[PDB]
Write a protein that binds this ligand. Sequence first.
Ligand SMILES: N[C@@H](Cc1ccccc1)C(=O)O
Ligand SMILES: N[C@@H](Cc1ccccc1)C(=O)O
Lengths: 278, 278
Amino acid sequence: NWLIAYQGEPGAYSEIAALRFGEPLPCESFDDVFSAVTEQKADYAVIPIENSLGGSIHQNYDLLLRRPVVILAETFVKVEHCLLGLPGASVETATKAMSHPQALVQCHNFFATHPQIRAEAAYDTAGSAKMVAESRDKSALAIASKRAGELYGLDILKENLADEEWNITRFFCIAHENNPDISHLKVRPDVARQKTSIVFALPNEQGSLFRALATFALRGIDLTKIESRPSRKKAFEYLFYADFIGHREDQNVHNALENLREFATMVKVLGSYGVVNP
Amino acid sequence: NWLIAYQGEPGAYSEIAALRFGEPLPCESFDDVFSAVTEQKADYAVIPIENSLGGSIHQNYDLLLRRPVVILAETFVKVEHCLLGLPGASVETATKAMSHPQALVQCHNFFATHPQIRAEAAYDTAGSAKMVAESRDKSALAIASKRAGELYGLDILKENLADEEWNITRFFCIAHENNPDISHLKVRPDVARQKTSIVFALPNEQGSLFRALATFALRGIDLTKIESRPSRKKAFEYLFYADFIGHREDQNVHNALENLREFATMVKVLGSYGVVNP
Ligand SMILES: N[C@@H](Cc1ccccc1)C(=O)O
Ligand SMILES: N[C@@H](Cc1ccccc1)C(=O)O
């Protein structure tokens, strides 16, 4: 399969990401995206893992943890809103821009300055595009992806509509752990400074984490991420997410990992992977 | 009784959180929320900081660091969705459910198992209970808090509509830096197991975090949160959120923090605070 499962519809930032890997299969949900891989509808999938403005997506992490799945690449999507109209395109004739409530909030400047234009709640940003194109009504605007504009044949009225640059979504392209297949991806991950992601669980002892970092830091190994959150039905544990620069088969790495399993209640390696660029 | 600025409208979870602290003052932006304290329109604010399902809210940590403000308390709000309807309304009779797209998608099974009832996007959850009451048709329902339904005289048709039983948002009650008055909260925070929140930035050398954690760990100090993200501002660095148990001016803690301040690029204590139980 060259299908890349994702959550959303065409023009969604999630699709943008699956495009960097292959042919997008859209899915109703996260839970659904992981299942397209499990039951072999799709070989791959791209899941949003963190966003610079929000957090880590702990839902997608519980799924990475539970699904017999493996990360094969990471990618980074710059969420840049476009204000988007029908051909014959004007801001001073419009009565509304539709979009996802969070896009609407993020474009709160545009709205306080443009009160002839009222924020309208839409299910998502891509469908907002979609509505404009079908409503055959040059009055209604959408706030969405350039790709949505592309696609629904709309014009960009306005780029960087929120006064946030650095709204970035990082996604992980994933496959079933019983075939980390790199060869069928659209573009092969840049492996020059390859990353490993793991989850581990510590019994919540004063010191535990210092102790688990020691494992990497006294081994010369650089981290790029670390996060705790509590474990809910294991009594007195936290879960930790940690990424670091290194390949899981590297002996130093392997030594770190074994070192951790000495006192970690569990370790999982979600994968060693490179990066795909726009 | 005293003014707790929060983002949203009556009904909202953020309002439930406001109310554990005083009289809620609803605001359109978090910017408005902080600027409300930072210029004495209100004495406190209730800020969402993380959710067990998404993660940390980076954008809020962002403003907590840039604002002359201090954590006075934390509480934890269980985000519990209800199907709300007018007196007489029915799940077998309903045609629409209105809510925030995220609450829609978090009750995805409900919608799958009830195809008669179409999911319909709205600006937020509480405004959805409002729309239901104002439109007066018994065929249109909302997904919103139990509070939003009471306010609006809507019946609760189903308790616990979401896919995931464990949805919890952690809020900070905040105040102005040099108006850090606990007396005029509505109940004093439980301060037995007092927590301190800090943020800091390190030059990104391998072992940095280990060396920083060494600071608390070799000192008997127990962490309850650790998370990294990359310095939006300095070229080569990371920010870390740390929470731990103790007070700023414990001998221990102070030592730890001073040692930290030795090599951290920056340290700000966001505050030392206990916990408001509903
Ligand atoms: N890479 C540095 C700093 C860092 C730690 C953890 C997460 C992100 C960055 C270290 O290895 O200690
Ligand atoms: N409380 C333990 C484990 C822990 C670390 C960091 C965050 C949460 C828990 C410690 O101080 O190391």
